[PDB]
């Protein structure tokens, strides 16, 4: 017997690597019933035509798992949606590689979806660890009115309520606005000084421009942000000493491809040893039923903890995301980013580089009236 997995990649050269991966997959341990085949397609500028072709390749090849990826054209919001919606009808597992938005984390909507990189609303643990190590108890939250901001706010609120402590204030600003001075002026007259920002770059530029006018980003303050606000065009108005977070393998794709190939091969090896299985549906237009071993395949994929790969252990959690991902804490000095800390997954540790806090000087600012 043979089983074949499908891929939706945006580079022909990657197809050279991906094939090699399965060529390496059915070389370490094969030679009976596990003759893996690889079928690949390419991304389409149009979104409607993606589903027709995706179940056309489903029909022609009756694949078991689909490996999706992100294109270079930056919208990164609806690119894997047509594949996840169509493949979710038959409950065939689909695991992404370079997706970060938190809408796909909801298991109620996207029934069968797995991720390799942690979502955007998953770095609040880094902020909590930084607060613990630097001993900042009074914070000011400032988020945007959207799914990502609400999810991050909920996660941070739960994490802080685990300690029976709450944030001083929670500001919510309209995404894509043009006048911010009122809210920031209101937040200016308070007690806490630590300001945590989580929003998109386009409005992050407006937030920075508004804040820089009110003489509030001077000395004695502390700024913490995510990853989106550091990259992009929002670096023009970023004040000095703004602490930020970065993933250690956020852009590499060959490592993710090898990781996905290895974990899928291990899952299929562990699953094919059990009887009472049914082949995928034959055609996209054939019949409307449900895969018998869909949820079983999803469970056996979730329980699969990879031993060691190019990106470390690949142990999932009971959500569809990745656990124990390293982080790099970067401070920018004089418009230049330099890594100053590293977060293993449990507790962060610093490096041998004295940071420069906002407004110059070098101390350990605390923050209080």
């Amino acid at each position: 017997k043979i089983v074949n997995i499908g891929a939706v990649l945006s580079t022909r050269k990657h197809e050279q690597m991906f094939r090699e991966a399965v060529n390496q997959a059915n070389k370490r341990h094969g030679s009976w019933k596990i003759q893996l085949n690889a079928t690949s397609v390419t991304h389409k500028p149009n979104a409607i035509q993606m589903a027709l072709s995706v179940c056309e390749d489903l029909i022609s090849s009756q694949v078991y798992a689909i490996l999706v990826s992100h294109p270079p054209t930056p919208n990164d919001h609806f690119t894997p949606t047509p594949v996840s919606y169509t493949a979710g009808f038959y409950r065939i597992p689909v695991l992404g590689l370079t997706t970060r938005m938190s809408i796909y984390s909801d298991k109620s909507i996207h029934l069968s979806f797995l991720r390799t990189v942690p979502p955007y609303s998953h770095q609040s643990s880094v902020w909590f660890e930084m607060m613990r190590v630097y001993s900042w108890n009074h914070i000011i939250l400032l988020v945007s009115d959207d799914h990502e901001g609400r999810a991050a706010q909920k996660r941070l609120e739960t994490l802080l309520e685990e300690r029976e402590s709450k944030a001083e204030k929670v500001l919510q600003f309209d995404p894509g606005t043009k006048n911010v001075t009122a809210l920031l002026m209101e937040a200016k007259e308070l007690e806490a000084r630590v300001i945590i920002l989580s929003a998109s770059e386009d409005d992050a530029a407006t937030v920075y421009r508004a804040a820089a006018m009110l003489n509030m980003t001077g000395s004695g303050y502390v700024w913490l942000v995510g990853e989106r606000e550091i990259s992009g065009n929002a670096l023009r108005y970023a004040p000095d000493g703004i602490l930020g977070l970065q993933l250690i393998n956020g852009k590499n794709e060959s490592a993710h491809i090898s990781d996905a190939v290895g974990v899928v091969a291990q899952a299929v090896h562990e699953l094919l040893e059990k009887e009472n299985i049914t082949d995928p549906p034959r055609g996209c237009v054939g019949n409307t039923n449900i895969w018998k071993t869909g949820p079983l395949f999803k469970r056996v994929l979730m329980s699969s903890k990879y031993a060691d790969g190019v990106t470390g252990r690949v142990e999932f959690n009971e959500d569809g995301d990745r656990k124990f991902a390293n982080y790099s804490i970067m401070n920018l000095q004089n418009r230049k980013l330099v890594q100053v800390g590293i977060y293993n997954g449990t507790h962060v540790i610093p490096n041998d580089r004295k940071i420069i806090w906002p407004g110059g000087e070098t101390e350990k600012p605390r923050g209080y009236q």
């Epitope: 992009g232 065009n233 670096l235 023009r236 108005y237 004040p239 000095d240 920018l332 000095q333 004089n334 418009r335 230049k336 980013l337 580089r353 004295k354 420069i356 110059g360 000087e361 070098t362």
Partner: antibody, heavy 119, light 109 residues
Framework: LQLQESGPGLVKPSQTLSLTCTVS?????????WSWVRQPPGKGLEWIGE???????NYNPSLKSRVTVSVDKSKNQFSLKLTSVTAADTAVYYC?????????????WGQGTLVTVSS | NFMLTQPHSVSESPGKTVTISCTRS????????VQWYQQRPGSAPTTVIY?????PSGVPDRFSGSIDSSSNSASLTISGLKTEDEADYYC?????????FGGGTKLTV
């Protein structure tokens, strides 16, 4: 605020070179940055590195592992310690102060010294 | 890291206007500022343009600049040329990793 440059002329090939730029009319302990830039004869301008007043440096990636910049605010002078020099390093060397700003802007540049490497 | 390309020398007659540009090769000049530096031979180079439209209070009002973001270029519109303008001009911009200068320009009368 004005900057003064002083270099020990030419140096022997494949040796260590040390320039000393002094600042008169201001205090090193401030919220600015101090940097070095060099220009080969009839060529472009290449940035070397910047050093903050207190503790930390930044270097050009091409020549990162050949420079150990230093400062001393007890006497208000910063020094360059280029090591493992080559034959094609003869250039005019400048010491320039750049404000903290939010932009990288060099003002005011020093007089500059001429540095030649040969035997 | 990247590189800046600008033409070498421009010919012009007194009493008119000329423009030169150092077009960015890799990336786009929209997330960083550009600065234009004067340089008289045998002298320390001095600032003539910063933030693309500022002017220090030591230079006569004959310089201006703009960014089009179409060909990724910046302008150095100079009006009312005189005999005290024969010098070399530089353009400089930064990024998130390093700071790089440009080439050269030999304005002639």
């Amino acid at each position: 605020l004005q900057l003064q440059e002083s270099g020990p002329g030419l140096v022997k090939p494949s040796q260590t070179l040390s320039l000393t730029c002094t600042v008169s009319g201001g205090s090193i302990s401030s919220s600015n940055w101090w940097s070095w830039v060099r220009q080969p004869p009839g060529k472009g301008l290449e940035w070397i590195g910047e050093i903050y007043h207190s503790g930390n440096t930044n270097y050009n990636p091409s020549l990162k592992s050949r420079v150990t910049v230093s400062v001393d605010k007890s006497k208000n002078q910063f020094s360059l310690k280029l090591t493992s020099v080559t034959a094609a390093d003869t250039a005019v060397y400048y010491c320039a102060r750049d404000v903290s700003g939010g932009v990288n802007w060099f003002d005011p540049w020093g007089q500059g010294t001429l540095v030649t490497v040969s035997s | 890291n990247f590189m800046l390309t600008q033409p070498h020398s421009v010919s012009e007659s007194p009493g008119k206007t000329v423009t030169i540009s150092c077009t960015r090769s890799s990336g786009s000049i929209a997330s960083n500022y550009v600065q234009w530096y004067q340089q008289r031979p045998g002298s320390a180079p001095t600032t003539v343009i910063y933030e693309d439209n500022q002017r220090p209070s030591g230079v006569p009002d004959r310089f201006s600049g703009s960014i089009d973001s179409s060909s990724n270029s910046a302008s150095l519109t100079i009006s009312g040329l005189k005999t005290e303008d024969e010098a070399d001009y530089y353009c400089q911009s930064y990024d998130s990793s390093t700071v790089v200068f440009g080439g050269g320009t030999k304005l002639t009368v």
